[PDB]
RNA sequence: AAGUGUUUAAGGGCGCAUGGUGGAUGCCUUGGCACUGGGAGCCGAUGAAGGACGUAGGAGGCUGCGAUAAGCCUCGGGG
């Protein structure tokens, strides 16, 4: 639920706002690694592209 | 009565048999060498060449990539 589509329809507000929420996630994500709870531990590279994709469509808004 | 007389192997030699070590030989190859015909003949302050450190769930090397870190987006090819 974090396609390149979607993202592009959310605003700049909400893309930044989804931007942090992915970092908590992926703080989070990290701590249970880190502690051994993480059975999906998928999670982790899913939440860094999701960050990834969130920048990219910043950055191309920003550039135009 | 005198004389004659094979008979041992601590070890060694030679040879044959049978092994070990070693990595020659033969047959190869993932790698090189010399060229042929084309492309491109420059990259860099829009920060180059080259790197240090990082980066995958897990330690390191090589590879890829830079805190968007074996990766992000768009457009194509393929199934």
Redesign the pocket.
């Known amino acids: 639920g974090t396609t390149?589509?979607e993202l592009r329809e959310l605003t700049d507000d909400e893309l930044k706002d989804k931007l942090r929420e992915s970092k908590e996630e992926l703080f989070n994500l990290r701590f249970q690694?880190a502690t051994g709870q993480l059975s999906n531990?998928?999670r982790?590279?899913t939440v860094?592209?999701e960050?990834?994709?969130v920048?990219?469509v910043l950055?191309?808004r920003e550039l135009g």
């Open positions: 390149p589509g690694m531990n998928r982790l590279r860094r592209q960050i990834a994709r920048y990219t950055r191309e």
